[PDB]
Amino acid sequence: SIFSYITESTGTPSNATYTYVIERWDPETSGILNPCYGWPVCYVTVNHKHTVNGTGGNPAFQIARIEKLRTLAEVRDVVLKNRSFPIEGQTTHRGPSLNSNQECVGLFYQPNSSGISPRGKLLPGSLCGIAPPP
Ligand SMILES: N[C@@H](CCC(=O)O)C(=O)O
Ligand SMILES: [Zn+2]
């Protein structure tokens, strides 16, 4: 799984600044495929749930192009090579009202590198608000 959690949500449900931690991404040993393999363009990003359905907002930043990577394990290899973990920082949400159970910052896949991301979703196995085991 991919473990991330928000440690502070400053503001209101519809206008918030999140402080977050993406703490750990466990090895990918079950053969899960990259859900955006074969798209013309796909990014893995740090992004947040923007709607009640969990679709992506404006990403904090993009980590890598991944549309040529067939498996989720290959995506993990590229993310862990290019970013030291834990990934920590802030991002912002302005849009639909989200309660704490609807807030989440994590690793999204998406075709766009900036702007609201209706086709962006958390990568498979993303856990929001749950700490990893020691
Ligand atoms: N930077 C955008 C954030 C949009 C979002 O919630 O993804 C704004 O403040 O309008
Ligand atoms: Zn948002």
Domain regions of the chain by residue span: 2-128
Alpha carbon distance 34, 104 (integer Å): 21
Structure token pair of residue 74: 């290959």
- How was this model experimentally determined? X-ray
Q: Which of 93, 103, 105 to mutate to test the pocket of ligand 1 (most atoms within 8 A of CB)?
A: 93
Distance 17 CA to ligand 2 centre (A): 10
Nearest in space to 99 (alpha carbons), one of 9, 7, 19, 2: 9
C-beta 112 within 6 A of ligand 1: no
Structure token pair of residue 17: 């600044």
Q: Which ligand has an atom closest to residue 98 CA?
A: 2
Structure token pair of residue 97: 């009202």
Provide the resolution (angstroms): 1.8
Q: Which of 47, 50, 51, 92 to mutate to test the pocket of ligand 1 (most atoms within 8 A of CB)?
A: 92
Alpha carbon distance 81, 22 (integer Å): 15
C-beta 49 within 6 A of ligand 1: no
C-beta 120 within 6 A of ligand 1: no
Nearest in space to 69 (alpha carbons), one of 30, 108, 32, 114: 32
